[PDB]
Every structure is written in C-alpha cells, then in structure tokens.
C-alpha cells in the first residue's frame, strides 16, 4: 500500500474505490490489465467456464481451453522453431521452472541473470532477482550457482560514450565471470529481461544483446527471457525481445497480463527443450486452470482484434513526446525512457550529476493521487508509467496534464509528504 | 496425460467426458475439490466478482473479498494464537514462504522435512520434497541446508513392534542427525505433513508427533505443517493437525481446495513468526486474487453449510468399514488406513511378506476406469481413495462396489494392460 | 591444549616433557605415529634429503622420493586394477579430492557419507564429516549435495538383533533417501571408514559393508574408503578395508602415518578415475614435498622390515584379550571393541541400559596421565587405545596395568578432576 | 609435469637435474623458495629437529618451535593489534579458515572475492578463486553465498583513464552487487591479494584499496588478506599491503615460503576474531609440524639476518629498469609490473591493440629452457618473474640476458615448439 485505497469495481483504465471516487490507473496492476479491467469478453469467458468446470489438472484430464491455449501461445511466441509450452501459477514459477528446463536439457549447473532484474518471489526466480536487498536478507543461503552480471545503463555513463561504447563496455563486464571463475561449457542459461521492469525500464542497446545472443549460441548456453512484465503488447510489439532482430529465445517466461490477472503462467520453450521434463516430476495442481485458461484466450483475442500492440505503439510514441516536452520545462526530468505504453520517467536533483531525487518522484505520486491518478516509483527516483493499453485517448491527456501539474507543484513547494 | 481424455463439464462428484461418458471422480483433483464440481455457491460467486473487479495487486491496494478471507482463514486455522496470513498461488510457494518466515524469524539456516513427503515444485518446496515420483533428478543443484528424516511407517514394521515401539524407533531415527552433523540451535524448522498425502495416506502415531512437537519447542526449531493436501475437512476434522492432542504449528500452508482448484494458496502463521519477513520478501502478482478471493469464501462457506467436515468423518469410517469387510475376502488388500474420506489401500503379493504388488494395483485401476470410476495409484501399489466430501451415498457405494468387484477379478486373472 | 605441556622430544612409544619425565603414548598423535617416534630410518631420510632438495612442486619438476612413493603406493593399494596417486598435504584436502575426482569422473553431483564419520577440516571434508557439532556450528552453509547416512552401530541394537538383522537394519536405512528424494544415479560415491575411528571404533559388520559395495557397484556410484586414521598396518593388515572380504575400492584416502606426522596424503585410485582431473586445476605448492615422501617411503620400509601389520594383529588380539579380563572384574566396561592395536573401550553406567559414563571416562584419563600414561576419549565416554605399532611388550604391558588400576580406583571413589 | 625433466639437488638460485646439467631459478617453486633452495640455516633446523621430535599434534600437546613460532608471527604481521595464529599446512586450508573464521565471527553468510584471484585447491578456497588456470569445471556445486568482483587491471584502459578514474570505475563494480542483491549486512567478509600472483603480477592502485578497506569497516564486514605468494619479502616489504598506507587486517592468510616450502601455513588475525573458533571443531593433524615451524623459524631468521626485504625492493627496481630498458628495443612487451623482486613481463601482438601474444611468450620460456633458465607464464601471455630473493647479482644478469636473447630470437622467428 501506498495511500491505503481499497477497490471496488474498475473498467478499462478507470478505478472505482469502496466509497466512490474514481482514478486514472497509470500502474495496470505492474502490467497485469494491458487489456483493461473487466473487459466484456474476458468477464464472460470467465463466467461461461466457471459454470462447466472450475478445475482440473490438466496432468490426469485434458480440458478445451488448455489444448487450445497451449496452441496458441505456441504460434504467437518469437520465432519459427516448433515451441511446447508449460503451465505455471506465476511468472515466480516460469522462470523456477526455466532454471529447470535449462538445466535438464543442458545437463549443466550455472544460471546467468541481472544485477536490477526482477524475476519472482520462488527461491529459484528470487535467487536470478537482482532488484531488492530484502529478497535475499534473512532467507538464505539461496540457490547455488547463481551469477549476476550488470545490465547495461545509457543513462549514468563515462564522459563520451556512445551506445556503441556502452554495448562494449557492459559485454566486456559479462564476460568476465566467464574469463575468470565461472565455465561456459557449465552455464545452463542467461535469462534476460529484454526490458528491465523493476529496473527503471531499462532497454539493453541492440549491439549489447546481439553479443550475448551469439556468445549463447557458440557455447551452447541457452538464451532465456523473460517476457513477465514486458510481454503481450507492452512495448508496442507482442514480445519486447521484437525490439530486437531476429532474436528467438530457447525458452521465454510469460505472465502478468497473460490471463488479465487471474493466475496463469507459461514456458514457452523450443520443443526439444521442453522435452527435457514433464509431469508428474513437475506439476503445479492449479495451473493451466480451466478458468484461467478461458479468461487467457479472450484476452489474447482482445489483443489481436483491438489492434492493442499497435495502440501501445502509437500512444506510446506521444506519451514519449509529452514527457519530452515537459522535461525540457521540467529539469528534474533527467531521462525519459518510454517503448510503447511503457515509460521510466527518472527524476534527478542536478541534470549533470544526475543523482537520484526520490523525494520528489514521491511528491509527484502523492500529488497525482490527490488529483485521481494511480502512479507509483521504481528504485525511488523513477516514475512508472504502464496504463492500460486500452486507455482512451482522453483519459491519457487527463493524466498526462496531472502528472504535468504535479512537476510544477514539485517546483513550487507545494507537495509535503 | 493420465487417462488421456478430454473432460467436458464435471458437478459434485460426477465426471462427464467430451463423448458424454459419465465417470465417478475418487480423486477429486489430487484433493483440489473438498467441495464437489461446480458447486452453485462458487459458480456464483466466480460470476458476481468477475464482473466487478478481476484483478489488482492486494499490495498496492486491497479488495473486499481478499480483505474478508484473511480474516477468516485466520479465525478457521487450528489452534487459539493469532495469526497472520500470507497469500500465494500455490501449495508450492506457500511451502516457500514457510522456509523463509522460519529462517527470517530463527535467523538459523536448516530445514528438516521427511523422505515420502510432497510440498510442491518450486526450488525450494522441491527440496523439502521426498517422494520418489517427484525427485530432483536433472535440476539439482537444489536449496543449501535441508536435511530429509524417515517418516513413521506403521505397516512394514519389525516383528512384534507396537505403535510405542514405531514411535520410538522413528523418533531415534530423527534425532540422529541432531546427534552427529545437524545442529539443532541451527535448525529453523520442522516441517511435517501431519498425514502423508502422496507418501500414500501414511499417518504419524500421537506419541511421534507429541516427540517431534515437544522436541521443536526446546530447541527453539519452529513446527510447521503442510495442510495442502490433508486439510478443509479431508480428514473429517478441519485441519489433519487436529487428529492429534493439542498441537498448535507455528506456520501453515493451505492451498488446493482452498478455493475449489482456482490457484490460490495461503501461509497461516502465528503473528510474531509472521511479522520477522517484509513483503517484498514474499509477493506474488496475482496471489490473493479477488475472483480466486471469493470463490475460497464460498468454499468455506459450503464446507460449513453443509457440514462436510462431519460429512468426511462419518463416511470416512463407513468406507473404512467397507474396505475392511472387502479385505476379508481378498487378501491382495494388505493394509486400509482411512482418516476421513481419505484412504490408502496398500495392495501385496502376500499378507506376511507385504511385498509391494504394483501390476494388481495398475490391473484395479483399469478395471474402475473402464466402469465408470476415477481412481488412481501412489507408490505403484496403493489405491489413493480421495472423493469431494459431497459425494452422496447412493454414487460412494456404487464406486466401492465397482472396487470390490475390481478385486475379484485380478484375483481371477480377468483383467489385462 | 587438551594436556596443557610441552613435550621436549620423543622415540618409539615414550614422550619426553621439558622437566624430564617419561610417558607412554597410547594416543600416536591420532594414529600419526604408527611407526614409533622418531625413527632412526625415518630421521635420516629427512636429514639426508633436506641436504639435497628442501622443496620443488613435482607438478613443474619431478624429484625422485615422488616418483617412488608415488610407484609404491599404487602397487599396495588393495586390489589388482591399475592405479594412480595423487599427492595432498592432510588427510582433509585428500578427502576433498575425493569428493572432486567422483564427480568428475561420474559426471554427478551428491556424495553419502556417514553419521558419526570424521573426514576433516576444508570445507568439503568437514561437509562429510558427521562427528562434533561445533563442526557445522556458525559457518555454515557447507558444500552442497550431501547425505549423512547411520553408521551400523553392533552395541546398542534392539533385543534379540543378530549381527544379521544389523547389518539389514542398517542396509535398509542406507536406501531410505534413493528411494525417497536422492538419486542413485545423480550420487558420485559413497566415502566409508571401514572402522569409525572419531565415531569410537565402530566396525561396519561384513555382511553391511558387502551390500553397500554392491549396491554402488550396481549403480555406477563410486566406492570411497578414508584409511587415514585405520590404514597402514593399524588395524593388523596393512588397510581397514581388507578386513572385509575382496573389496577394492575406487577412491582411497590416506594421511596422518603416511609420513610419520610429516604433512603428506594422497588419494590412491583406479587409473580411469584418477585422470578425470590433473594439476594445475588440483593442485597444492607443498603437496608432495620430497623431504616427505622420503620420510614416507622411510615408514613405509619401516612397516614391512619391522613386520609391523603382524605386530599390530597380534599384540592387538593380546589386548583385547587383557582388556575382556579387565572387563569381568570391572562391571563399568560396557564393550570392547578391538582390531589390531586398535580399540575403543566403551565405558558405560550400567551394563544393561548401555547410558554413558562420561564422567567416569575422563577420571581414567586423569588418573592414567598422573600415573605415566597418554590416552584419551571419544565421544565422551570411549577410551581410544591407538599407541604406536612399535610399543615393546613390557610397555604395553605396563600401561595396561595402569589402565587396569585406573578403573579399580574410579569404582573406589579414589579420582578427583 | 610441466618440463618432464626430473631434479636431483639445488642450492641458492640453481637447480640441477639427474643428468647433471644447471639451471637458473626465475620461479622459485611459485615463490615457495624466497630464502633460496637448501639454504644452510635451514637445513640444519630440518634435521636437528627431526632427532628430537618429528611430530606431535600441537592441538594435544604444545612443542617449543610451535610455540616460538606462533609468538614470531603475532609480532611481525602488519599492524598494532593484538593477534592470534592457527596454523595450517598449506595456504588452501588458511583460506579456508579465514571463510570459518569470519562467519563465526560476524553470524554472516557472504564471502566476497575477486575474479584473477588464487586462493588454492580446498573447496572453500577454491570458490573463492578466478584464475582461469584453475576454473572449477565438473567438480560443482562450489561452496554456497560466494560473489566474485572484477580486481582493478591498470593495463587495459579506458582511452584518457587516470590511475585516480581506474581506482573510481573498479570501486563502483565492487558496489554494484550490494546495491542490487549482497546485503552488506550479511557479507561476513572481502578476501583480497593485495598484488594478485595468479592473476598476473597486478596491483590494486592505493586509492581503489583505501575504498574498499573503508566500506568494509563501515558495514562490519572482515577485510582479509591473501600473502600466501606475495608475503615474506616477495614485494619489497615484509608483506605486499603495507605496500598501502595504514591497512591491519582483520584476518590474513601466510604460506609457500613460510617453511622454505616444507608444508605449514597460517592465519593470522586480530585476536577477538580469532577466538570465534577453537579446535578440536577446527584442527588439521599435521599442521604446525615441529619440523616445518622449525623449518619456518629459520627461513624467518635468514630473511632478517640476509636482508632479503630490501634486497627485493633494490633488485627489484634493478630489474624493473632492465626489463623497461628490453620494452625499448623489443615492442612485444607490452607492460612491465615490478614490485621488488616480483615481476609480470606481459607479451602483445600490438603495442595499441593490447591484444595478448600466447605463442610469444611460451616461445620465451621454451627459449629460455633449452639456454638454462627456468621461468614459466601466467594467464598465457604474461612471463613470471619470481626468483629466489638471495639470487646473486651475477646470477640475474645471466638469466636477464637469456630474457633478452629470447625476446630477440623469438621476433626473428628462429623459435619452434
Ligand atoms: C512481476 C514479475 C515476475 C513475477 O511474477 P509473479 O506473477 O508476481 O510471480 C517475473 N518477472 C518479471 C519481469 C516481472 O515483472
Ligand atoms: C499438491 C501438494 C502441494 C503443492 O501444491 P501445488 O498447488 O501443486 O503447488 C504441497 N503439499 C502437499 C501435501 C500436496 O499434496
Ligand atoms: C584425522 C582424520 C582425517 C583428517 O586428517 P588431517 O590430516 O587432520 O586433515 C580424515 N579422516 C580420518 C579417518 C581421520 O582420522
Ligand atoms: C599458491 C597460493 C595459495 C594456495 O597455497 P597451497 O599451499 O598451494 O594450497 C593461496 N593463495 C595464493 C595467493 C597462492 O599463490
């Protein structure tokens, strides 16, 4: 909690609280409602199965909307190599689960993930994690064989350097546990969030993530993303890793949006891989539900049919030019980084030291609550922006105007906390 | 796939394939579904919420039903203490938070589970984890620090061996690692399913559980308890803890029936163990949902309304009766042992050598499912007899006559794979 | 300081303090002194080899002493397959090259070991171990993937167990977590002591002890034995394990005598295993030194010129013999174990509980050093009975009467700590 | 064996093989030999100690060198704190005593260590390790809660770096783990070479090791220090960190010369640290032999009474200035890093390229072999440079001028393997 707001009912991109007051969502439950709250074919499909079959695991009996989403989501991932797909709860049990699959096919041990990165609350994902001290204080010892290396920030860099520079730079620091102490020959995978979520929304330049494709592919590490946040329309194509060329994943986590909420997760890997384990050894007794299964194809369907990933892609290059223009009125505005309806607003004290400001990032949420629009931080000093993509065109200048209105206020001194 | 079928619809304890075969269900889901299929309070239920709100994120902002299910699962948990909730999607992360609220709450690193147990498929619930059928084989290596204790097993035992002689032996047998590498002033928890589900229905004596418990609270270990398979009524008391004298756990996890096979699962744990963790430590996006919220109020309102707890108990030990009458005319029936509707037929090749006869036990099987009944095996040899507590009389002596005359005929030698 | 006193010099069996006085040794600093103190052969090995070459690491130049010693010991090693050795500086780190040289050549990670077990001091033999502890006490977490199995335990077994029904038991236990969550084809070896030395002299029966050799031969798990604290002559063969009948082990460590307390191991190994790794991955600088392997192969003549198995076979069955007298007038020995010079003498309350007496263990020990004699104890209330192979007779025959008084005067009342 | 050539004897700097033939020592058995090979003084301690006693476990009874010994070495480590020192027989289990030392300690879990770093063989030590020359590949998994940093390499810059920006961006890769996933409040310890010997002969810059030094002591985590290779005058003073301004320890890890090669090592550390752990939790058998401390209290002795500190440090410059004056004339030298007697001569095809010459430089020690002189590389392009500090002028000339033949014959291309 932030503000202590309980909810009601919500549609679309607006949320009604128990005593009436309704708010402009700018956070979609951390990219979980890309297709709007209760959306009508979503509701219904929900209702429509609930009356048939709450649940079965899928392990004993087949039902429809499983075979038919296992389908589905193998067509619509990247790439043309024959997919499997694996139910899970959470993107958590995605990504334990692609430690598992890397693992098993590779016969190998190491796991490579990202200092920033956020994979999940499960021991395997909250080991990858990278994101938070609270996630390792107090519980540990962790998984074993776990390394993380940077991930690449074009924000805080040396005097001079170019993307170019930078791509070379953090390559070279990914290559030095591989250079040192850590065999290639024995890392089962790299997982990769094409996109930083939790991170800021920070997006590996395109050079950077070419390199740690191909080195993958020459030392037979499998190359996995994670697709949890940044996925199912997000940055204004289907899949963030779409950001980058002819780049497919060995396995790939999805989830959040996936079932608009309601709790489904998938492994979406190359057949081979994925034939590496099943059930009964791993099973989730409530994943692939029927019902979440069914709330999963409408939402799918939604995506496609109400040209979602392309609104994400031209509101989100609007958005871009809003924020743009607001920082060049707004110096507390150090870096605008927006890829679709999917935005890291990072707020600094000084333009040229670029040190964080996290009291005024929470001013301006405190702020933007106060006037109806539901906005939080990352890592302090970052302002998350990741409506709905449904989010009519109207709501978003209503929302845009706000947070514009929260910068002066900042300004003036008129915001306390 | 087990049975390589496609379900169509399912209510109560019926079963109705694509085809419109009709099949009696004696698995209820692995004990997903206390409640019966579809039952009209949860369809509802499901309905009416869906239609409001299908999601957000209860760490940023609480819902009614959520809010409302906390404190009754709070109240319902055995014991008199306090307790705090913490909402997962699975059995499997549930058995997560519970190593890391007894390490943050102890600051000790060791975790002591037993061999034949299940507690899920993620990183660290997998290592607790003991069964054969689901072992770590191709993923290792698993979570630093668990160690794996024998449990009480009552059937194979030593020649003129009592109850108090099982316990004594198995209590000898878990304090020899505490006796030679394991230091107990390191051990943060116990964890313990009070019957075996997947083990193949195998209940601790009284006097090795008030051992373990009273050995726990010297050294200062935390005693938790896996109810995800055994609880909500199973055992025809609510909670399978409760089949022995006044033992309180100090952590709980709950799931499966919970809310009729939706994914949704809780940690119940006295408030002070509860309070030592955050949360960012333990979160999972969609756990706690608000339709998988209020489809679990319902449930637990059904398991009152219609007294299912009473209902397990009293057809639990008509069915015990049954199977015991059954096992005086086929001697292939080695052991019934039945808590609740809750049962584990052990079939052997002989009374005296108990040795294990998986094929009889495969042969049943077959037979039930080509007469219209659901029922499967644990441990190769053992019948597992888990119906939805609502199963009414009339369909309960149906399937246990298509039971009985599956004994006779694989002592005939009637049946073949 | 366990005696808190400054020994000047030594020589066979009798240590010499800085006041002049005499004491016999029935410790061999652990076994370390199988050859008596300073041996004149051993003393002019060391004296005439530091005059050549003090030390070079034989990974960049080979010496002479090592490529003999090197010949020697995988020509006595037990059994007829081709061997190689590799060289250590302690019993510990040739153990952790054991754990090193099975996983490498298995391709597997776990390692069994055995409750009560001492291996040593690095963290991967000490991971093994299971004796003290303070061992695992505050510096955990400890090498993943290992199993602590019971150690066959011949005293206090259940009334009316043959050595039959032990060995069973036992067996049975030792399967236990291969059938529950250990794979047997992800376990690298198992490391055995064939007598516990730290454990109190506890010697695995012969049936025990072939059931384990075959089920690792069955599976591809390598058979491990320690002979640090039981090898070279003192168990009256020259190995522990070939008072077993024909089993030859793949891995086996050796320490402590090797070099008469020089710091020297190896791990003697079939050939296919022992190429699996080389320096200058496994590696260490003083491994090896020729002033050690000169001393080495100087005991190592020792042992055969002085027929010094024999000795130990035949002085050992004499004092077990004096030691079942005593025994008959002194109600407090509960059991005597002895193989070779080499007992442990278990001191108990009361004959038919079997409870330890501790205290009555250290007051022999307090009485024996006042009187001229250094012995010490195991596990609280074992005496442990190693002196050097050596010993003449009327020495021997003198610390046995001390020990002989010692207990007359315990039941008298006669000993203050 | 890395010459297959076998030693018969040596003296000072000289090395002579069983055929007679003479070589010059630039390697000194990985700086084991700092007071030169068989060196009289200490040969007499060898064998006068050996007559009076070859062995007791210090542990049970004390001995007079141990003791002098241990008072010695509290005395001349660095800084005015009380000390303790706990002997070992190799500089593989001192490193992994310092990790059981600092986890008792602090009750913390993390140990930080560097990539290029060389610890040593032992399990613990050897997670900590990042020489690419001993990777740790199919021995998996390693110890648990370990995380390698890069170590600041002054060579391969930045385009304009200073020593002052090289000191800053090495600093900031060592924060980036604690500001994402490493608690600092459970880190128990940093283990540091303050000149890596493995890694190449590279010397953290001043500013870098006073950064680090201070946020240990901020955040209660232990600095220790590895002087196994660089200890004991190898630098040019006593021991390679007081090549810094005002750094004491908290925990510091002596071995190789300590004993002219006989195998003894220590930790030494201020005193309150010490204590955490005792012994017999924490003991090796043959560790603080009397023959090795007494070995160790004569190598001492020649070290004071020859000089041998300042010695390093003039021949040293001495050498650096000849090995800068052969850069003028052969352009393959890339870097020459000298400090005393302890030199990295580092090979490249290109001068601005950097890019390391593998082939160069075992063509030089190939060269320099065949025209008596011993030397040996390091991370394949780096030529070591470790002779005996009592090399004689003389002596070096004629070994420096082989150096510069082969530099000379190797550019003509009259070298072939
Ligand atoms: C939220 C998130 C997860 C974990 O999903 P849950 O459903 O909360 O377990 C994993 N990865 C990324 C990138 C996320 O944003
Ligand atoms: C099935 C089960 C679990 C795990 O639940 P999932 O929802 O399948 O993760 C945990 N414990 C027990 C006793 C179980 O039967
Ligand atoms: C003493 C001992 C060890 C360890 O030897 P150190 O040389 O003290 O490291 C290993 N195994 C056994 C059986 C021992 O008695
Ligand atoms: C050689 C070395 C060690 C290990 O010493 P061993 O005696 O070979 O176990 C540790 N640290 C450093 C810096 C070394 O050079």
């Not at 519980?139 to 290396?149: D, K």
């Not at 930078?166 to 790299?190: G, I, Q, W």
């Not at 000093?381 to 845009?400: G, H, K, M, S, W």
Request: net charge negative; aromatic share 8%.
């Amino acid at each position: 909690n932030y503000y202590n707001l309980v909810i009601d009912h919500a549609h679309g991109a607006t949320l009604v609280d128990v005593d009436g007051n309704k708010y402009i969502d700018l956070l979609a439950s951390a990219s979980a409602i890309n297709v709007g709250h209760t959306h009508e074919k979503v509701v219904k499909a929900i209702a429509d199965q609930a009356q048939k079959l709450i649940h079965y695991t899928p392990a004993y009996f087949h039902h429809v909307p499983g075979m038919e989403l296992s389908e589905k989501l193998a067509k619509i991932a990247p790439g043309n190599s024959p997919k499997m797909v694996s139910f899970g709860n959470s993107g958590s049990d995605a990504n334990d689960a692609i430690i598992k699959f890397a693992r098993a096919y590779t016969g190998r041990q190491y796991i490579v993930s990202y200092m920033g990165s956020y994979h999940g609350s499960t021991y395997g994902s909250q080991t990858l994690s990278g994101s938070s001290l609270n996630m390792t204080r107090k519980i540990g010892p962790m998984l074993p064989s776990v390394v993380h290396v940077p991930y690449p920030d074009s924000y805080r860099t040396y005097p001079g350097e170019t993307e170019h520079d930078v791509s070379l730079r953090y390559f070279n620091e990914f290559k030095k546990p591989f250079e040192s102490f850590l065999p290639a020959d024995e890392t089962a995978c790299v997982l990769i969030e094409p996109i930083q979520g939790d991170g800021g929304i920070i997006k590996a330049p395109e050079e950077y993530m070419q390199l740690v494709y191909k080195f993958c592919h020459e030392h037979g590490i499998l190359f996995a993303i994670d697709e949890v946040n940044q996925g199912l329309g997000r940055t204004g194509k289907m899949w963030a890793i779409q950001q980058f060329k002819d780049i497919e994943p060995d396995l790939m986590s999805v989830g959040k949006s996936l079932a608009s909420g309601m709790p489904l997760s998938a492994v979406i890997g190359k057949k081979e891989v994925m034939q590496s384990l099943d059930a009964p050894a791993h099973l989730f007794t409530t994943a692939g539900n029927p019902v979440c299964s069914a709330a999963s194809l409408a939402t799918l369907d939604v995506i496609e049919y109400e040209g979602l990933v392309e609104k994400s892609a031209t509101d989100g290059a609007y958005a871009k030019q809003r924020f743009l223009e607001m920082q060049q009125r707004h110096p507390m505005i150090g870096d605008v980084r927006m890829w679709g309806l999917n935005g890291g607003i990072e707020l600094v004290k000084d333009p040229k030291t670029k040190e964080p400001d996290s009291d005024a990032a929470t001013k301006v949420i405190y702020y933007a609550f106060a006037h109806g629009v539901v906005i939080i931080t990352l890592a302090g000093n970052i302002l998350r922006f990741q409506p709905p993509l449904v989010i009519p065109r109207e709501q978003l200048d209503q929302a845009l105007q706000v947070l514009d209105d929260a910068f002066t206020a900042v300004e003036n001194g008129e915001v306390t906390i």
